[PDB]
Enzyme design. Sequence first.
Site, short mmCIF file in Angstrom:
data_model
loop_
_atom_site.label_atom_id
_atom_site.label_comp_id
_atom_site.label_asym_id
_atom_site.label_seq_id
_atom_site.Cartn_x
_atom_site.Cartn_y
_atom_site.Cartn_z
N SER A 98 0.83 -1.19 0.00
CA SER A 98 0.00 0.00 0.00
C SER A 98 0.87 1.25 0.00
O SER A 98 2.07 1.20 0.25
CB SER A 98 -0.91 0.00 1.24
OG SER A 98 -1.68 1.19 1.30
N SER A 99 0.23 2.38 -0.25
CA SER A 99 0.89 3.67 -0.29
C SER A 99 1.06 4.26 1.12
O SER A 99 1.88 5.16 1.33
CB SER A 99 0.03 4.59 -1.15
OG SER A 99 0.80 5.66 -1.64
N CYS A 100 0.26 3.76 2.06
CA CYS A 100 0.26 4.21 3.45
C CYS A 100 1.56 3.98 4.18
O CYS A 100 1.79 4.55 5.24
CB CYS A 100 -0.83 3.48 4.23
SG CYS A 100 -2.39 3.44 3.38
N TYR A 147 -1.83 -0.59 10.31
CA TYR A 147 -1.87 -1.24 9.00
C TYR A 147 -0.52 -1.10 8.28
O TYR A 147 -0.01 -2.07 7.72
CB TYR A 147 -3.00 -0.62 8.17
CG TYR A 147 -3.05 -1.02 6.71
CD1 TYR A 147 -3.50 -2.28 6.33
CD2 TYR A 147 -2.70 -0.11 5.71
CE1 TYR A 147 -3.60 -2.63 4.98
CE2 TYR A 147 -2.80 -0.45 4.37
CZ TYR A 147 -3.25 -1.71 4.02
OH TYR A 147 -3.35 -2.06 2.68
N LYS A 200 2.20 -3.94 6.80
CA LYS A 200 2.61 -3.96 5.40
C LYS A 200 4.14 -3.93 5.24
O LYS A 200 4.70 -4.66 4.42
CB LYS A 200 1.96 -2.81 4.61
CG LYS A 200 0.48 -3.02 4.34
CD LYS A 200 0.30 -4.33 3.58
CE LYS A 200 -1.13 -4.59 3.17
NZ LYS A 200 -1.16 -5.67 2.17
N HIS A 240 -12.57 6.54 1.12
CA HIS A 240 -11.77 6.81 -0.08
C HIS A 240 -12.53 7.75 -1.00
O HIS A 240 -13.72 7.57 -1.28
CB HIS A 240 -11.32 5.51 -0.75
CG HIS A 240 -10.40 4.70 0.11
ND1 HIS A 240 -10.63 3.37 0.41
CD2 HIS A 240 -9.30 5.06 0.83
CE1 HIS A 240 -9.73 2.95 1.28
NE2 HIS A 240 -8.91 3.96 1.55
#
EC number: 1.1.1.271
Lengths: 317, 317
Positions: free
Chosen positions: A105-107, A134, A138, A177
């Site tokens: 993910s980009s998070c 989260y 990841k 989102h």
Amino acid sequence: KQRVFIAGHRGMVGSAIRRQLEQRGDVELVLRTRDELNLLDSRAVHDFFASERIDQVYLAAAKVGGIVANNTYPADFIYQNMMIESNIIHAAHQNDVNKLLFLGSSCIYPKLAKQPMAESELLQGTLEPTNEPYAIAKIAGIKLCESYNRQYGRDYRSVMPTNLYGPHDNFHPSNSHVIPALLRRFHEATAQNAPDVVVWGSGTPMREFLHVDDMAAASIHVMELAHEVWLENTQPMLSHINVGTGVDCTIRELAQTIAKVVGYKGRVVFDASKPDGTPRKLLDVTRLHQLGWYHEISLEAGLASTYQWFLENQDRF
Amino acid sequence: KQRVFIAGHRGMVGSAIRRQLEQRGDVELVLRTRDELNLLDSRAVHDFFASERIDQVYLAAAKVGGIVANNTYPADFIYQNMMIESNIIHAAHQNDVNKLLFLGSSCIYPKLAKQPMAESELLQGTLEPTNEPYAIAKIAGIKLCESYNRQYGRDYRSVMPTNLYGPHDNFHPSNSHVIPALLRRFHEATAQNAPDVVVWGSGTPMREFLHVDDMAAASIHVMELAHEVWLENTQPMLSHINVGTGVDCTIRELAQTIAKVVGYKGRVVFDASKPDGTPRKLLDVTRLHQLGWYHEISLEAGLASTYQWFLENQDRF
């Protein structure tokens, strides 16, 4: 004939990868539903890898959610993602599956990262509080891959997508989102003939969006690259590859485009008395482009087709 | 009477905590050997927590090692530590154990952190490559605790110790930790009457050391603090507490003190043609001191007693 296991094939990214691999006979798909195979169960996962003959693994299963979910169930988000990653990656190695692609993910990037964000921005600063649990899970997933590659000579690759959208997304009212939330609001505002739609913020912050089908294409591309080519464009301890468009657009442009796609005739209003998030956020996709992959779906085109999907499936949300 | 489970009670820190809790009748210890309870097995761990009636958990079990081990078995270090943490923390919550203390490490801090290192230095920069897999697992352990505290209202605390030493350490020739490595070398050099002992580096870098018994004392202290007192001195998402002396000394001073403790009459020589590590590395123990805990064992005193232990147990290494 390559036997491919796509973990979490019903999710948004999982299903997109499945749709594209189903369209070729040199691949045979092995799929299990959450009811058929409990990914949190170590023994169940090991038993599965022992019984089936898997050649490749697309680790697309994850516990995902919006702003409310991540802050409301932090323990479930870190624990479940850690278990799913650990179970699959370890069971895969134990059963000689040499190829695996981990979808991140980009998070995972620092809240105040340098823009655009290159892969080397990983672990360079503090994470966004909302996504912290989260994100940690990841990052641990990426490091598991690198560690198995280093120790056992495995070929466990990973890709970090920017903001995604497309069919099978969470169009429910609860989803935070921006794309699915706005598609839904503009749809109803159009249907109810509302004079205006107020969006919080100034509309000036810039974001990057990628259609899920382009995501699936890049994923399969990276997965299928020659090992020597992949090694040549990554480092053993900085192996992930950013997947995105590298193109950013303001929330104002996004909102205005969604309004057009939906046929909304009212006014789009930005309430500037509400705070904006970071001014800009997009990925540096240099590494991906050098690997010879470029996105095909433009924003307007992707929103139009995504809206079409939403129309034919609205009686699910 | 509090029923306490000390995971990994045979390890260096685990055994130190056990030694001190055994010396009080208001606590009843529940202990399991690696052979009796496989910590990597989710079902086994859950079964254990279901069968026994645990009130507190000291999570001291970990896959630890030196420079060679961490670079040679990276996958084992990240995977095993992630599984042990996840299994215990989740099983504990599932079975209503409200109190838990997670023992981390000093490796979790950025390689180029500001000195002395305050708790807020966590995740502020890139990790030391050698310790990366292990460090990621430890950080995930801290975030699991914070996430269960936030979501379920648990009381899962964590402490990050500086460099430790003392009885039950790894005195084998393979161990890279400076204290046990030097105690061993000076012992043999003294026994063989060697003219000198050459140590790589200039001897100028500064390090911090804490005796394992002081570590155990601080651990039990933090574990037993009033919840309101702990909450008052930490933040929900920055909850760990550094444990150390806050005092640093050069490798030269350390080597010279070990030589004296062992009775070595030869010469201690530093080969400056070899590179040093970071110039300084110590923890900011402000938070710990404000919680009212201060170390008791000084370096000379701790090395002397540790050497004594080594003497009575050398036929194990």
